[PDB]
């Protein structure tokens, strides 16, 4: 009933160009079995969306990586939000929602926007730059650690820690094993910064600790919730902004439309999130036998969702392989869907919007002018190096 495929979605070949294999996975059926890892897979929009929106049946508390927490020990203490199901998920989620809330974005927008304009002005003085190290990495590093309230010392641990976290959702391949081998100094730094005395007043970390007297979380839960923002809050945005710049570099007609109406900046970023999907895949575990898209899956089985594939599924999207900054993007799954849908999406969209606004107002052309190099991670998609020449408007 269910087709068995040998495709390895965690292989370097797949990362280098996932799109043909994703079509093969979608077209094989609504539910496939991946023999390489003994997991079920769903690559169509319909089933990805259905799985995400049934957290009772497709739970997160057994881990959102390949590893089943009922069978193996997690590599670090489980996240109180990502790796929790309702009702345990609900109150920590509400705290992070209020910490990263629509109202909070007002307190940071002016500074985030000025830093984006400043970075684009700096890059234009150099002309030829690496849009990864010099922009996609440099911009979030210039705003997010400060908004968290982190001290300056030790910030070089943040991107390695995040890469470790996202590699650790994969199978026990070399990318994952090597990340864990190297992890001790990054875990040590990150855990220490999560303690209340190490988080500057007014930042996101201090605000999480301030919620420990309302009855929503206790003091001993706050450090792990700070850990969540230090895990998911930087490397995702690096790959999102890198994706947007890569899209504008490859589709100059869309850069021209963005220049002509900079208020398209926010949707141009959302479309980049759909088109490249910085978070490509992750898992749920079944809590019962379940029928999904006409197939029967037993209890206790890992189900791999292909978010990037769902975002390119022609059953859902017109011209899915085109980057279109005026596309109606509502419904894409690049930030997830349902109860776990990205709690930091307003921070991500703010960074992306203000960066693309700066480019729209200040840059006339973005031309790739060197070898493009991909960065390999078990669940994040993005580039290692993107040499571009920026021409001023």
Ligand X SMILES: O=C(O)c1ccc(-c2cccs2)cc1
Does 310 contact ligand HEM by CB under 6 A?
Answer: no
The CA distance from 14 to 11, in Å, is 5
Residues 6+ apart with CB under 8 A from 126: 134
Q: Which of 136, 268, 279, 325 binds ligand X (CB under 6 A)?
A: 279
Angle (CA) 347-269-362 rounded to 5° is: 100
Q: Is 336 a residue that touches ligand HEM (CB under 6 A)?
A: yes
Partner from Cl ion, ligand HEM, ligand X, none contacting 165, C-beta within 5 to 8 A by type: ligand X
Task: Single out the residue of 138, 273, 358, 366 in contact with ligand HEM (rule: CB under 6 A).
Answer: 273
In angstroms, the CA 68 to CA 84 distance is 13
Shortest distance in whole angstroms from residue 92 CB to Cl ion: 17
Q: The dihedral of CA 64, 66, 69, 70: what is its sign? A: positive
Rama region for 386: left / alpha / beta (φ>0; ψ in -120 to 50; rest): beta
The residue count for binding ligand X (CB under 6 A) is 10
Return the bridge partners of 34, or none. 5, 39
Stretch that binds ligand X, among 29-37, 147-155, 225-233, 251-259 (CB under 6 A): 225-233
Strands 302-306 and 39-42 turn out to be parallel
**Residue 348 C-alpha from the chain's centroid:** 9
282 binds ligand HEM (CB under 6 A): yes
With CB under 5 to 8 Å by kind, the binding choice for 334 among ligand X, ligand HEM, Cl ion, none is ligand HEM
Report angle CA 251, 359, 327 to the nearest 5 degrees: 45
Does 232 bind ligand X (CB under 6 A)? Our answer is yes
Shortest reach from residue 25's CB to ligand X, in Å: 19
Phi, psi of 35 (to 5 degrees): -60, -25
Radius of gyration (C-alpha) of the chain in whole angstroms: 20
* Binding letters toward ligand HEM, positions 202-231, x by CB under 6 A: --------------------------xx--
User: Which residues of the shown chain bind ligand X in the complex (CB under 6 A)?
Assistant: 79, 81-82, 165, 227-228, 231-232, 279, 282
User: Which residues of the shown chain bind ligand HEM in the complex (CB under 6 A)?
Assistant: 60, 64, 81-82, 93, 96, 100, 228-229, 232-233, 236-237, 240, 273, 278-279, 282, 334-336, 340, 342-344, 347-348
């Amino acid at each position: 009933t269910i087709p068995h495929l040998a495709i390895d979605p965690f292989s370097l070949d797949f990362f280098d160009d996932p799109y043909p294999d994703q079509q093969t996975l979608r077209d094989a059926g609504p539910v496939v079995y991946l023999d390489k890892w003994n997991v079920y897979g769903v690559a169509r929009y319909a089933e990805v969306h259905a799985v995400l929106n049934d957290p009772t049946t497709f739970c997160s508390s057994r881990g959102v990586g390949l590893s089943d927490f009922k069978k193996e020990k997690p590599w670090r203490p489980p996240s109180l939000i990502l790796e929790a199901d309702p009702p345990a998920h609900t109150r920590p989620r509400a705290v992070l929602s209020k910490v990263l809330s629509p109202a909070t974005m007002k307190t940071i927008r002016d500074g985030f926007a000025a830093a984006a304009d400043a970075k684009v002005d700096e890059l234009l003085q150099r002309g030829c730059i690496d849009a990864i190290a010099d922009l996609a990495e440099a911009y979030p590093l210039s705003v997010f650690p400060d908004a968290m309230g982190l001290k300056q010392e030790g910030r070089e641990h943040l991107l390695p820690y995040a890469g470790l976290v996202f590699n650790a959702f994969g199978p026990p391949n070399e990318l994952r094993q090597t990340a864990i081998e190297r992890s001790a100094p990054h875990q040590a730094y990150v855990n220490e910064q999560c303690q209340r005395p190490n988080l500057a007043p007014g930042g996101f970390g201090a605000c999480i600790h301030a919620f420990t007297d309302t009855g929503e979380i206790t003091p001993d839960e706050a450090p792990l919730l700070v850990r969540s923002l230090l895990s998911a809050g930087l490397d995702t945005t690096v790959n999102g902004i890198g994706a947007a710049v890569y899209c504008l570099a490859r589709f100059p007609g869309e850069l021209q439309r963005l220049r002509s109406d900079p208020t398209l900046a926010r949707n141009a970023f959302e479309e980049a999130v759909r088109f490249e999907s910085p978070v490509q895949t992750f898992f749920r575990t079944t809590t019962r036998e379940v029928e999904l898209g006409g197939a029967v899956i037993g209890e206790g089985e890992k189900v791999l969702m292909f978010l990037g594939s769902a975002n390119r599924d022609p059953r859902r999207w017109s011209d899915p392989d085109l980057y279109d900054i005026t596309r109606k993007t509502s419904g894409h799954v690049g930030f997830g869907s349902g109860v776990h849908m990205c709690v930091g999406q307003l921070v991500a969209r703010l960074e992306g919007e203000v960066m693309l606004s700066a480019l729209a107002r200040k840059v006339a052309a973005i031309d790739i002018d060197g070898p493009v190099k991909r960065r390999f991670n078990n669940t994040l998609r993005g580039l290692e190096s993107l040499p571009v020449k920026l021409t001023p408007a």
